[PDB]
Design a protein around this ligand. Structure first.
Ligand SMILES: Nc1ncnc2c1ncn2[C@@H]1O[C@H](COP(=O)(O)OCCCCC[C@@H]2SC[C@@H]3NC(=O)N[C@@H]32)[C@@H](O)[C@H]1O
Ligand SMILES: Nc1ncnc2c1ncn2[C@@H]1O[C@H](COP(=O)(O)OCCCCC[C@@H]2SC[C@@H]3NC(=O)N[C@@H]32)[C@@H](O)[C@H]1O
Lengths: 235, 232
C-alpha cells in the first residue's frame, strides 16, 4: 500500500510498533537484499561498542539489508551512503545537515542523525537513526527542533529510501563516486581531536581515495585515519 | 514510522512492492499473531476455489495472521470480521457497502471487496482484497469509481486495520457479537441461487448462530448453507 518505486532498497519493508533493535533484527533474520526494517521505537537501540542510542517515538529508526557485489576494498564506504542519504533528505526539507566523519550528521554542530554499518561479506546491514519529531538527548537536535514545526515521519521515510536506493545503485556501478559526495557535504577545515589508541589534534583537511580522514597536525605531520574504534571530537 | 496504535493487528506489517499472494506468504512463513502482510500488487492473487483475484497497483491487498483461542465452532466467523471491517471502513469514506454472503462486499450490487480465510496449522490467515484506485473487472467497482476521485491508499489501510483490531479483540471475548453486525449489513430478503451441484434457488432469509445462510425454497423447505457461491 506504500507504493514505493525504488529498484532495490525498499522492495520490502518490515514495520514494528516496537523492536529491540532494527540492526540486530536485520543481522539475525533471513532477509532479502533491499529489505528495510523500521520501528516506531527501539528498546535496545545502539551505536558502536554497544553504546546506547536513544530511540523514542517520533524519530526514524531503520536498517537496510544489503548484498553489495563490489570489491572488498569498497565495502567500508557503505557508511558514507547512509550519511549522504540523510544529508540529501535533510536538504529536501531545507535543513543544513553536515557530515561528521565518518558516520554522523550534524546541524549547527548538533547531532541529528547517526549511521551504523554491520555485516560480514555477503550480508551488510546499514543502520540509520534520524531524529525527526522525537525528544533528543543533550548534544543532539531534531528536524522538528530545527524547523520549529513537526515533520511528517512517513514523508521523511519516503525521501530517505528514494535517496538511498539511487545512491546504492550508483555505488554498485561506481564505488568511488560516493567519496566526492561525502567530501562536498562534510565538515572540513576545522580543528578536530582523534580519540583512539591515544589521541592527537589537527586540522581535518579532507578524505582520501580510501575514505580516510586526512589530518594535518601543527607540526605539519600528516596522519590518515581509518574509522573503526576511533572517535572524532570537534574543538 | 507508521505509528500504528492498534493492540494486536498491526503490531508488525510486512510490505511488498510485489508478491505472488499475501495469503500464500502468510500461510508458509512463521509470523507472530497480528502481523499484516500487504503488497502494492499480487501476481497470483486468489479467491475461493481456483479463482483468480485481480490485484493491480492501486488496490489494498493484505492478509492478517490470527491465532484465536476460541472454540472450534466460532472459526467460520473470521471471514465476517473481515467483511464487517471493510463495510465500516467504506462508511467512513461515505460509501455504503453491503455483504453478499459469505465473503463479498458490494456497492449497488457491484463487488468492491472480497475476503478469503485460510486455516493453516493453528494459525488463521484473514485475507482481504479491496478495490481502491485500481482498475477493476467489468461489473466490479472501486472506492475511486464510487467517490469520483483518487483515495489515499494508506488512509484506507489505517482505517481498516483500526476497525479490524477492534472487531478482533471483541471477537475473542464475545464471539457471537459479529453475527448481528453481519445481519444488519448483509443482503437479505431477496431471491438467490446457490451455485454448484444440487444448485437450488430460494429466499436468503438470514444467517443462523453458526453463520450458515438460511434459504427458504419455494416448496417451503428450509436449507442451511455452510459454504458455496451465492448469486443475486
Ligand atoms: N537519538 C540520538 N540523537 C543524537 N545522538 C544520540 C542519540 N542517542 C544516542 N546518541 C549519542 O550518540 C552516541 C552513539 O554514537 P555512535 O557510536 O557513533 O553510533 C551512532 C549510530 C547510531 C545508529 C542508530 C541506528 S537506529 C536504527 C539502527 N538500530 C540500532 O540499534 N542502531 C541503528 C551515543 O554514545 C550518544 O552519546
Ligand atoms: N479485483 C477484483 N474486484 C472485484 N471482483 C474481482 C476482482 N478480481 C477478481 N474478481 C471476481 O471475483 C471472483 C473471486 O471471488 P471469490 O472466490 O469469491 O473470492 C474473493 C476473495 C478474494 C480475496 C482476495 C485477497 S487479496 C489479499 C489476499 N491474497 C490473496 O491471494 N487473496 C486474498 C473471481 O472469480 C472474479 O470473477
Amino acid at each position: 500500500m506504500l507504493g514505493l518505486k525504488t529498484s532495490i532498497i525498499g522492495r520490502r519493508v518490515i514495520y514494528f510498533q516496537e523492536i529491540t533493535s532494527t540492526n540486530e533484527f536485520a543481522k539475525t533474520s533471513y532477509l532479502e537484499e533491499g529489505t528495510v526494517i523500521v520501528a516506531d521505537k527501539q528498546t535496545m537501540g545502539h551505536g558502536a561498542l554497544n553504546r546506547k542510542w536513544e530511540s523514542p517515538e517520533g524519530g526514524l529508526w531503520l536498517s537496510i539489508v544489503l548484498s553489495p557485489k563490489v570489491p572488498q576494498k569498497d565495502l567500508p564506504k557503505i557508511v558514507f551512503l547512509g550519511a549522504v542519504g540523510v544529508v540529501e533528505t535533510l536538504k529536501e526539507f531545507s535543513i543544513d545537515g553536515r557530515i561528521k566523519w565518518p558516520n554522523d550528521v550534524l546541524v549547527n554542530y548538533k547531532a541529528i542523525a547517526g549511521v551504523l554499518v554491520e555485516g560480514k561479506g555477503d550480508k551488510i546491514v546499514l543502520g540509520i537513526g534520524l531524529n525527526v519529531n522525537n525528544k533528543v538527548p543533550n548534544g543532539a537536535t531534531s528536524m522538528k527542533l530545527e524547523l520549529g514545526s513537526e515533520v511528517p515521519l512517513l514523508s521523511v521515510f519516503r525521501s530517505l529510501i528514494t535517496n538511498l536506493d539511487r545512491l546504492y545503485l550508483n555505488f554498485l556501478k561506481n564505488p568511488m563516486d560516493i567519496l566526492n559526495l561525502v567530501r562536498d557535504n562534510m565538515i572540513l577545515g576545522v580543528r578536530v581531536k582523534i580519540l583512539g589508541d591515544g589521541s592527537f589534534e589537527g586540522i581535518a583537511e579532507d578524505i582520501d581515495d580510501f575514505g580516510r580522514l586526512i589530518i594535518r597536525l601543527d607540526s605539519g605531520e600528516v596522519k590518515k585515519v581509518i574509522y573503526g574504534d576511533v572517535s572524532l571530537r570537534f574543538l
